[PDB]
């Protein structure tokens, strides 16, 4: 089973990448199963702003690694990130500020939940889907 673990915000970087103190070591995390636009792309600043606000304003930030590979090729931790028990990955997709990403190395536990969010944001023609 997956477990949520505590972490502390160091700096929000963009829509899908965030730097956290995890077990007393600073690490860059990349959100599983979502792709936000890059800052210089349409909805990029909006996605960055969204993730920044959610993590900065949360009382408690948690990381939940999945069952597949835990780091990407660029050294980033691959997790679901929660702020006060709300998943940032899902919130971005349901807001139409990220699309669901390909599965990477077995990390698929929340794929269906995120696809459901995405279908609803698309039906609502929200943001990226506008
Ligand atoms: Ca991206």
From Swiss-Prot:
Region of interest (Disordered), ranges: 110-130
Gene coding for it: nuc
Active-site residue list: 30, 38, 76
Bias (Basic and acidic residues): 110-126
Name the record gives this protein: Nuclease A
Binding site for Ca(2+): 16, 35-36
Domain of life: Bacteria
Subcellular location per the Swiss-Prot or TrEMBL entry: Secreted
């Amino acid at each position: 089973k997956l477990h949520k673990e505590p972490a502390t915000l160091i700096k929000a970087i963009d829509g899908d990448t965030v730097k956290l103190m995890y077990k007393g070591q600073p690490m860059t995390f990349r959100l599983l199963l979502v792709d936000t636009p890059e800052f210089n792309e349409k909805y990029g600043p909006e996605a960055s702003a969204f993730t920044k606000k959610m993590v900065e304003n949360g009382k408690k930030i948690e990381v939940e690694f999945d069952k597949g590979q835990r780091t990407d090729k660029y050294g980033r931790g691959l997790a679901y990130i929660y702020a006060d028990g709300k998943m940032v990955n899902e919130a971005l997709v349901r807001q139409g500020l990220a699309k669901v990403a390909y599965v990477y190395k077995g990390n698929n536990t929340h794929e269906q939940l995120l696809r459901k969010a995405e279908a609803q944001a698309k039906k609502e023609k929200l943001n990226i889907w506008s």
